[PDB]
Amino acid sequence: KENICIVFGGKSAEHEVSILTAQNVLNAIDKDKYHVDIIYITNDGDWRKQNNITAEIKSTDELHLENGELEISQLLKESSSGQPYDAVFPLLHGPEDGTIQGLFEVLDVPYVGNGVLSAASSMDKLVMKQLFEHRGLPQLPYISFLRSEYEKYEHNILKLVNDKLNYPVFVKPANLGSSVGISKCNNEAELKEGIKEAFQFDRKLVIEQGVNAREIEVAVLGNDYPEATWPGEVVKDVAFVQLQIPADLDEDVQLTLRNMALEAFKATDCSGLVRADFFVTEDNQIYINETNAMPGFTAFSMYPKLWENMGLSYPELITKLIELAKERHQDKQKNKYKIDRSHH
Amino acid sequence: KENICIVFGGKSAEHEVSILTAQNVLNAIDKDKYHVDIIYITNDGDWRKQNNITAEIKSTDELHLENGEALEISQLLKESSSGQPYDAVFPLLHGPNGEDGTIQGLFEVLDVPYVGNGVLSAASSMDKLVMKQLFEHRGLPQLPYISFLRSEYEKYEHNILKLVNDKLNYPVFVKPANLGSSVGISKCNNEAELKEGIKEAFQFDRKLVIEQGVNAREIEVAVLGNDYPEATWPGEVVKDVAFVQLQIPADLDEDVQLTLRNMALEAFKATDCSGLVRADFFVTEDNQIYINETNAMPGFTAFSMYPKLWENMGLSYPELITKLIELAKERHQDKQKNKYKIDRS
């Protein structure tokens, strides 16, 4: 029997979605196969652990833990069965991405999903776009700069936005995911204001050409030999979850999107999973928008539903993610041995 | 006094250097200005704390090392033995386990202010392929190179070997992308050697870089700052052949030195560094410049390149340590300020 730790909560009011997600995962997890503990990280950063979850959690209130089992390191290094975890499943963004993965790595705890680089890469929209560019994936025109750069080269930068992009454009802090400080700008005065607004939240920005496009998402699962689902659509009458799986798109367009999703996964060197989010215009021009390293993971979110469409049930998906974590961490340690052995 | 913690040792034989660097740093810190705790990470990865270093560390044996207090990872790591939070934590160790970027992640989770590079910059300059991609986007010159995953070599071996031939001039270097360990690096003079060289590197890493090699001079530039970084004049390790005395500034034309200074700033920005970086270039006999790598955690003994480059600029080793602390606090205040505004929208 394998020991699993679900970690959820977090310093933010991504709180409720994190708790809900944990309920879903806990209630889907195969239980005579998995011994399961939970750690609720409160907002204040108190880690509260409950051991050996056996019953269906009927209510989200159950998971707002009060009591806790030790220090952070002790919480993570040992399962309730007295032995290390086979996998820890983070269902929180760490105060951003990549930080909690660092902590797991320092503790040598096996964990689900993306690693440090890939998590942080995907959370920085500029880095992400540069990785996608190098890989040959199509993207909309954009510009990026640092505050230091804007402070010295404003006129030059604002000229770039005019010669290179068509309004409307979006100004987007590079380093959030929260959508704060995003602004749609229809002209240069709006752009100027958008930049000023945004720099109140971040020291680095991307200015992207807007499009009218469908929002098409592909789920990828794996480590070294990832697989991609048929795409799904986030259907919306107005751009500013209702899902259609598979997406109403030509077969050839679906195949291209599946293969680009695999390329996007590789470009940011993902592990475990990624959701690749595209723009597909009414003429079937395809741009990758972003990858999401920690996609919504509720029983009804796009990422699990894309897998269900392929015949991979939600309990089976969670199992697959866990075995991937196990494999990745096993492979890390084995290469350590070979390297150690080389040094000797 | 301000309150500082130095973290050193780690899961490696980086140990002896890391210990010496901790000594140097500690002896460079004015204890009437700073209250200093240290944390040693043993090879098995146990954290051991020694409080309130007040005297010169005349020898390493005066450090307790494994014999400091047994430390769990907890909110406590933010608190000095004075009972004040640390103003800055100075990591003088790598990612034995994980990558670079992992201890930074731990510090961010615990909201500990720390010196130097953040998660993404640390991790990106430790992955040679991401690093190269970032430098290419920034328009910095680099030697020709190819990269691939094991899974890609597995199914496209022929095409890849032919890409090497059609793109790279032999000899080439096979480099694991994710180690700084030099384990699995090899110099390959033809396809036969390359093939061997690839097979061997894949024993240790799942992603490789193949690079056109060049014998050339190795020239380094130090950069210090967060949002308004400054670069040193370049330096070089003194030697007649390219196949521990430094020359600072390097024996290079002034225009070449200036170009390098500015390239170092660009490399700093390309990997979104904080605190510092060392940019390491190749410069050929005809003054062709290629950035080799950035180093997010460059050697930091009293006699190391990074410190000596600043010394030539008039910034003493103690002043350099104080500046890095001040940049650490600044960065962390900036995060706190940003989180507040974000949260309040």
DSSP conformation class of B234: P
Answer whether B53's CB lies under 8 Å from B31's CB: yes
Q: What is the resolution of this structure in A?
A: 2.0
Q: Report how far residue B75's alpha carbon sits from residue B81's, in angstroms, rounded to the nearest whole number.
A: 13
CA distance A248 to chain B (A): 31
**How far apart are alpha carbons A272 and A265 in whole angstroms?**
10
Task: Check if the beta carbon of residue A184 is closer than 8 Å to that of residue A168.
Answer: yes
Contact A131 B127 (CB under 8 A): no
Query: CA neighbours within 13 Å on the CB side: how many for A323?
Result: 10
The residue assigned the tokens 């998995």 is A34
Q: Which two tokens stand for residue B246?
A: 């430094």
Interchain CB distance below 8 Å, B73 and A269: no
DSSP category for residue A46: -
Distance from CA of B226 to the nearest CA of A (A): 10
User: B204 with B179: CB under 8 angstroms?
Assistant: yes
CA dihedral of residues B279, B280, B286, B288 (deg, nearest 10): -60
Pull the structure tokens for residue B288: 């062709």
Nearest chain B residue to A71, by CA: B74
Say how many C-beta atoms besides its own lie within 10 A of residue B192's C-beta. Answer: 9
Q: Quick check: B222 and B200 in contact, CB under 8 A?
A: no
Phi and psi at A167, nearest 5°, equal: -65, 155
**Nearest CA distance, A166 vs chain B (angstrom):** 22
Q: What is the largest CA-CA distance in chain A?
A: 64
C-alpha A120/C-alpha A97 separation (Å) is: 5
> In 10 A of CB A102, how many CB atoms?
30
What does the alpha-carbon distance between residue A162 and residue A173 come to, in Å, rounded to a whole number?
Answer: 19
List of residues 6+ apart from B191 with CB closer than 8 A? B161, B164, B165
Structure-token pair, residue B145? 């190179």
Listed in sequence order, the DSSP H helices in B173-286 are 191-201, 254-270
* DSSP letter for each residue of A141-160: -EEEEEHHHHHHHHHHHHHH
Q: How many CB atoms lie within 10 A of CB B90?
A: 25
Report yes or no: A72 and A100 within 8 Å, Cβ to Cβ. no
Rounded Cα distance between A220 and A265, Å, is: 7
Domains in chain A, ordered, with CATH? 1-112 (3.40.50.20), 113-138+212-344 (3.30.470.20), 139-211 (3.30.1490.20)
Q: Does the beta carbon of A164 lie under 8 angstroms from any beta carbon of chain B?
A: no
| The amino acid at A275 | R
For chain B, say whether A116 makes contact (Cβ under 8 Å).
yes
Q: Give yes or no for a contact between A302 and A232, defined as CB atoms under 8 angstroms apart.
A: yes
> How was this model experimentally determined?
X-ray
* Alpha-carbon separation of residue B253 from A259, B108, B234, B291 (angstroms): 49, 42, 11, 17
* Bridge partners for B209 per DSSP: B147, B175
Question: Which helix (H) or strand (E) covers residue A244, if one does?
Answer: strand A243-244
What is the Cα–Cα distance from A222 to B313, expressed in whole angstroms? 50
Q: What distance lies between CA A271 and its chain's CA centroid?
A: 11
In sequence order, the β-bridge partners of residue B89 are B5, B114
Cα(A286)–Cα(B120) distance, rounded to whole angstroms? 28
Here the tokens at position A225 are 């030999």
Task: Work out the end-to-end distance of chain B between its first and last CA atoms, rounded to an integer number of angstroms.
Answer: 36
Task: Print burial letters for B247-277: b (CB count within 10 Å at least 16), e (below 16).
Answer: ebbbebeeebbebbbebbbbbbbbbbbbbbb
CA–CA separation, A233 vs A239, rounded Å?
A: 13
Amino acid at B139: G
Residue pair A230/A255 in contact by the 8 Å Cβ criterion: no
